[PDB]
Design brief:
4 copies of one chain form a homotetramer. The first copy, chain A, is mainly α. Helices cover 42% and strands 9% of the residues of chain A. Chain A has helices at residues 32-43, 71-76, 91-94, 131-153, 178-189, 201-228, 242-246, 259-265, 270-281, 291-299, 309-315, 345-358, 360-368, 393-419; strands spanning 2-5, 15-16, 29-30, 47-50, 98-99, 104-106, 108-113, 254-255, 287-288, 305-308, 322-324, 332-334, 337-338. Chain A is elongated and about 125 Å long. The termini of chain A are far apart. Chains in contact: A-B, A-C, A-D, B-C, B-D, C-D. At the A-D interface, α6 of A face α6 of D. Bound molecules: ligand POV (5 copies), the ligand N#Cc1ccccc1-c1cc(-c2ccccn2)cn(-c2ccccc2)c1=O, ligand 2J9 (4 copies), 2-acetamido-2-deoxy-beta-D-glucopyranose and sodium ion (3 copies). One sodium ion (NA) binds next to loops of chain A. The PDB classes it as membrane protein. The entry lists the keywords iGluR, Kainate receptor, positive allosteric modulator, Perampanel, membrane protein. It forms a tetrameric assembly. Structure of the ligand-binding and transmembrane domains of kainate receptor GluK2 in complex with the positive allosteric modulator BPAM344 and noncompetitive inhibitor perampanel.
Chain lengths: 420, 420, 420, 420
């Protein structure tokens, strides 16, 4: 006798073999879920007649008359003898049919776009030194220039003789004022030397140690920028569901009235209360109505989509824009369906545990999920550095020339006032 | 009739409550599988009496005569009914007892000691050149500058008329004193400039060859620093079982004759066959006897112990010097064991599936597997240069300013004694 | 009796000598396996008569009724004795005919088009910054320097007494003309110095912010150039069959239903199973019909054709745009076929082993497989920067000196017209 | 009946199993060559009694009485029925015994030490620019300084007025002499600016384009040195037997009176005449008497050792100092020995071809040759740069200070002569 195996089509479980040579009979189908069934028939004894569900659904109640819709209706009415399909073991189904012990484990997880690094900021020339170091080198310019100003006063060898023309023109002038001491410090830091050079041994040590400080700072900026521009190490804003529970910029998602959205409704964990407070209020914006439509909204928006973990492992290897941003939120499993009180539950159970010990469930999953190579990134050929990369030095230049005109007005007003 | 529950002692599973009052029966036990047996008894009705297995094992064939031991022997002889315990659902146990449908999912994953952060030190800036080079650059500054002082005193073309505006006389003068010849050497070394410049050809070949020495020193400081900061950014800790296959200095582990190494015997994946052949040829060093001895090996040595994933998440959570590298290798599950053909296989399968939908099997795991706070903060983000990496250049700067005040006092006293 | 030799037409194997005189018999053929059949006839005595196989194949089961074809059919039917030809010693042929012991060793290896050298161009130095940045740095030089000319003319503190030695007067003068303000901008940009330096605070904020702009431009030129020169030095062409397994943009090949792809069907190595599954799923694009069509695919496209190693060493030697990446994958051998249980299996095995000890099987291969000179020089050593990499900076230097002579003429004429 | 398999011990072919539990009988041995024999007995029908050669030799004649010495004496006298061992198929042996068709292919190849990079030269700071570029930047200093000297003469705005003190002191002095024009060029190249700055537009273009030339040269030196010090790509002096046929520094080698040395004696190829002209003349220096002794002389000298290719694949994976420096010079094969005219030649032949089609000869060789990991090098953690790396700038400094004293003597003699 041949068994009636009911079955639905999702990729890579059960998919139409699109080969030539028509008049196909029971060889129309391929996939992981068809390779499982031929491994069962080898290890059990049966022949299988693959007979698709004539409703296109997995199975649920209608909540008005209480009648099952799909494979679990073909399993309660004995129209099928197996249900080898992505049929998730849950509580309302197993009070009606009998499942075997799982051949595949999953959970809820997150789709999001892989980080890209094409807009690093109009700044981010400023990353090779930490903002502590960009601030401590600002204070060291203020520190050394005050120490230069103070030391050059009570250093009698800095008090030199200007006007060398008259040999005894007794006038004593120090060129280390307060303004000229910052211009040594700002001058020495930016590698273009100033017109002032210290002439006493007390001020040549301050100038000499600020020069060695400056070499180590610029050589650490140029070397760590050569590290950043060689090894591009880019990261995502969110790295979990709790890091995503705070982000109001990235908006969440679910299939409308699915197994994934129902989990957040019945949840009592504090993080998944906040994630359902979001999607219930912002309904028709984040709650998509298909998992294929939800992949497009990750792709054409800033959108983190909550769906099953076995689809994300499939989709993110057919599309290298896409990645998985967590672990597993729920925990469910795919079970081979079996009608209620049937001798086939315990035989598929010991079969699935037999194919697992051999390594056959892993080799079948790596054949149907690991599809396209998705060319995992290398130390990529570097591209020319542009306005998207350095960028913001044209801002601090234009903000530095505006500050100059406000001082050039100020120097004109101040001199003309004290002239009169 | 009250059910008799077979049970092993493990942690966070069935334990003993530590208290003084010795009036104990059915109440001396706590743990995960006592909270599970409490909540399976509530929603199904039965009253239980916990009896630890006297044999102390889980279950296996003795291979002498094919007799079972441990918990699956007490179930197959119908001595005690349930087996609420970490009794993993495997193929050889399923043919002799009937498990429930899983309450926990584990796998094989890898302990490893959490990567300890590098202590740079204060003078970490000084590293891209060897300590023989930093001495020989400092001796060449005292060398070249004393060669300038000898040559520019001896050369006739460096004796020039210092006063072209102050009317013409015979008052010829060098700019190269001993304190000024050092300042050409220290000034030219730091890529800034001194106020001096050589005028004779004998002093320009000194300056012109000290300028080429200076470029090769500073272009090799910056390029060897960009070498380290790139290599430090390329390197990554192991995050897979493939990464353990490549490495040689990190040694593996397992429990000798356990469920973990039995997976690597029957394995056919070439990445796992290399992992078995590491510990097939080698033994008595990395095939340690217990889980507790395997933790101590990772904790001292460079061991990479492979146990089940539910024991790692208890160990890694408590001792926060430890981590879990990679994902899961196997995929197994814990089931409530019940004897062969029993009416409580199906009443507990539905009872376990009810506690998953309500979320109780998550909150029972978070109660026993989170334990201490154990400050998991560890802000492991880096590669911007901070005060730990380049912080000693502020200490060399600060010591150079304290030294200069001590010379500033010295110049004030040496001038006043010349004055009075 | 004279022996009748079965023989196929291939190159550098049995060919036709191209000449006009049509008096041909046993003398119209040349090639490797005619020089071998000449030298096996010398040291063993026999006289031969070469007869091309009419079927035109080598040999295989037709699978219709288990009948052989080609050369191993003419041997098994005892029609012609020897089979001096590229008749590879395989398992299915050894059960029906008796080979000699090999005269040539081949394997499976990979054609690939020889990696074509990058043409840098003249202005290749100009690449670590994008062409929008090189324009915006040049506009900021014309921008900042015109802001200096406006401010230092307007600011009262830049008007200073230019003559402190020339006795004191009211002859105040700026150093910032229009030609001098450009020279602060061009001078400070190139990390050298102008002879000028700002004296007023309104012009020091211009100079002090153009000095910070200059550092970030030059530290990003040097660090993005160290990014490219490191990445260019990391990258390597494929040199294995493992390196083809990783890559996606390079597509594979084989002869459809041939000895090469039959190896990848029966293979169990995971690196070769990934190479079969590339061309198991994909077909009608990379499973080309012949060796000659497979060479043209590598020669135009990004094809990586896998044929036998003795045909590559003939193809790679003649068309020097082609190479052999990696070593050998299989290991096979060519034997002189002889019918089942013959007295010439052993007399030729010793005769082939004599020609190896004397060295004749090497000199016969070097005669037919070296062919053209085909200038294999190709000095493929690099990574020192030469005139092809940085050579346009000498052309920008040479154009800057020709431009200056044209301005030197212009200054001589503009002064003489002012003179006269 | 049990077969008598004669056998010799070399690793990894036949090696004593050093396990515990004595009273071993016919389980003393392991290796590739024992794993082959159990694969033959599975695929043929026999049982095998491993009975070692009682002479310790493979087999040859004595050239006085003509009696075989070893396994091929036990094969001619029917004391053994197989000779499964590293017994190379050659012409003088197969006229006496019968070999099967080969289970392993080899040839003569070269041992040499892997390149190390611990003595790159006391120079080799000088590698990031090619010696064309170090010379063309020397000529550009001479070129621009002559163009600066020529242009500054007929540029009337360079002829400025010194002595600004007297406003009408009509004297016209140009500070761009011939010596001061090289000091601009050498000054601008070494990034320490000179005291001369051009004042006419004709000389500011020459100075301005020599500054942009200088930035691109120093930024290309620092960036290509950061490429070299990050990716260490080190190469061997020899890369063939013809590149080694010229090198008299590296001296050659062979086992004395072996299969490898006899090939160079009987050779007629022009390269292997020159390599035997060497070893025959320089006997007792290059011709070692054991292959284990010859590996030590590669290791404790500069010595290229010529030995069999299957040992080099074994030895260079147990010792990461060692590497293979060519292809294959000879071509031989290992054959299962068989007595003269025996029914076992044709059965081992079809067996070896059967284990090859399955992939068993490759999986057995990868198990016994791929031993220790030999930790294939990464982008290694860079080490501090030392006297072994930069080094020779202390030579050009000390050679530049000696040239200064010879000019400082010269300037003293020249001035004192024209003074008198
Ligand atoms: C003769 C007198 C001339 C004087 C002016 C010239 C002298 C100085 C010249 C300076 C710049 C000239 C260079 C070319 C133009 C730069 C364009 C650019 O780079 O855009 C950058 C901003 O850079 C800006 O220009 C922002 C303007 C400053 C606004 C803030 C201060 C207001 C001052 C106002 C007036 C100040 C100036 C007036 C001071 C007197 C950013 O571009 P983006 O859009 O983010 O690109 C997309 C990035 N993405 C790909 C990641 C998405
Ligand atoms: C070459 C080394 C030697 C030079 C050292 C020079 C020291 C000072 C240098 C830099 C100091 C900057 C400290 C800020 C650190 C980060 C803060 C930040 O990112 O936010 C803001 C940037 O902040 C600015 O835009 C500040 C502009 C700096 C110009 C300073 C003028 C120096 C002139 C002379 C000074 C001499 C002394 C003056 C006293 C007389 C906004 O950026 P964002 O919105 O976050 O951009 C998004 C992209 N991102 C997320 C990737 C980041
Ligand atoms: C003339 C008076 C001079 C003083 C004022 C000068 C005026 C202005 C000049 C410079 C000041 C302007 C810059 C800002 C502050 C500089 C310091 C700084 O940045 O601290 C930061 C780092 O640096 C440190 O590590 C601090 C440690 C202080 C110890 C000093 C002992 C040597 C003093 C020499 C004695 C004389 C020797 C005489 C000869 C023998 C603090 O950061 P952090 O978070 O604590 O980092 C901890 C590091 N860790 C993470 C690895 C643990
Ligand atoms: C920072 C960039 C800008 C600076 C550019 C500076 C321009 C000129 C700079 C360098 C020119 C060098 C040309 C030689 C090139 C290779 C030859 C060689 O290696 O052999 C020899 C080296 O040769 C020397 O030792 C030459 C020393 C040059 C010192 C020049 C002093 C500059 C002073 C002022 C000059 C200004 C103009 C003067 C005109 C008035 C011997 O070495 P080796 O035995 O082979 O070492 C073994 C290791 N190895 C095998 C790995 C190699
Ligand atoms: C005032 C008079 C100036 C001249 C003397 C100045 C004195 C001193 C100044 C400079 C001289 C000192 C340096 C040494 C020689 C410099 C060149 C050189 O190195 O050649 C080398 C490289 O460079 C080349 O590619 C040469 C090509 C010449 C074409 C010039 C056209 C532009 C001229 C603009 C006309 C005016 C424009 C006006 C405005 C529009 C030759 O090497 P190669 O082996 O041939 O390399 C081939 C490259 N390839 C391998 C990829 C194929
Ligand atoms: N990081 C960093 C750093 C920053 C400025 C100057 C030097 C360094 C540095 C350089 C090196 C190094 C070493 C070899 C070759 C090249 N570079 C090492 N270290 C460092 C970092 C941590 C601990 C000890 C040393 C360093 O801190
Ligand atoms: O629906 S189940 O058969 N029973 C409940 N659970 C979990 C306890 C997590 C799991 C976990 C993983 C599965 F594959 C199946 C199930
Ligand atoms: O022992 S099972 O009931 N059947 C086998 N498997 C797996 C398919 C992975 C799993 C995986 C997780 C489980 F919890 C149980 C099982
Ligand atoms: O067809 S064979 O005589 N036997 C099988 N092999 C082997 C690689 C072992 C080889 C290898 C190279 C040959 F030339 C012949 C043969
Ligand atoms: O000694 S053989 O059996 N006959 C001669 N040769 C070669 C022609 C190269 C080879 C080449 C590889 C072998 F494995 C055996 C032999
Ligand atoms: C981690 O380190 C110490 C010893 O290195 C260990 O004893 C302890 O468990 C950990 N220290 C903590 C958690 O502070
Ligand atoms: Na059962
Ligand atoms: Na780099
Ligand atoms: Na023979």
């Amino acid at each position: 006798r041949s068994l009636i195996v009911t079955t639905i089509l999702e990729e890579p479980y059960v998919l139409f073999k699109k080969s030539d040579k028509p008049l196909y009979g029971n060889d129309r189908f391929e996939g992981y879920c068809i390779d499982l069934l031929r491994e069962l028939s080898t290890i059990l004894g049966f022949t299988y007649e693959i007979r698709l569900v004539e409703d296109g659904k997995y199975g649920a109640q209608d909540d008005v008359n209480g009648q099952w819709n799909g494979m679990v209706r073909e399993l309660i009415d004995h129209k099928a003898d197996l249900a080898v399909a992505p049929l998730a073991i849950t509580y309302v189904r197993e009070k009606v049919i009998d499942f075997s012990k799982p051949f595949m484990t999953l959970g809820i997880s997150i789709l999001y776009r892989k980080p890209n690094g094409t807009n690093p900021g109009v700044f981010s020339f400023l990353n090779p030194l930490s903002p502590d170091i960009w601030m401590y080198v600002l204070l060291a310019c203020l520190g050394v220039s005050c120490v230069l100003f103070v030391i050059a006063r009570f250093s009698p060898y800095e008090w030199y003789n200007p006007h060398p023309c008259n040999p005894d023109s007794d006038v004593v002038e120090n060129n280390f004022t307060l303004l000229n001491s910052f211009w040594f410090g700002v001058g020495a830091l930016m590698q273009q030397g100033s017109e002032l050079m210290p002439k006493a041994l007390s001020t040549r040590i301050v100038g000499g140690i600020w020069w060695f400080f400056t070499l180590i700072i610029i050589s650490s900026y140029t070397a760590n920028l050569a590290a950043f521009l060689t090894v591009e190490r880019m990261e995502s804003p969110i790295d979990s569901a709790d890091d995503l529970a705070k982000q109001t910029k990235i908006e969440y998602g679910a299939v409308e009235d699915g197994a994934t959205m129902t989990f957040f409704k019945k949840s009592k964990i504090s993080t998944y209360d906040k994630m359902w407070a979001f999607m219930s209020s912002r309904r028709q914006s984040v709650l998509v109505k298909s998992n294929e439509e939800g992949i497009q909204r990750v792709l054409t928006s800033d959108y983190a989509f909550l769906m099953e973990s076995t689809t994300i492992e499939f989709v993110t290897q057919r599309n290298c824009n896409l990645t998985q941003i967590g672990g597993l939120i729920d925990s469910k499993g795919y079970g081979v369906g079996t009608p209620m009180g049937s001798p086939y539950r315990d035989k598929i159970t010991i079969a699935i545990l037999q194919l697992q010990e051999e390594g056959k469930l892993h080799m079948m999953k790596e054949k149907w999920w690991r599809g396209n190579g998705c060319p995992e990134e290398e130390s990529k050929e570097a591209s020319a550095l542009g306005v998207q990369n350095i960028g913001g030095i044209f801002i601090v230049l234009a903000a530095g020339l505006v500050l100059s005109v406000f001082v050039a007005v100020g120097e004109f007003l101040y001199k003309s006032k004290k002239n009169a």
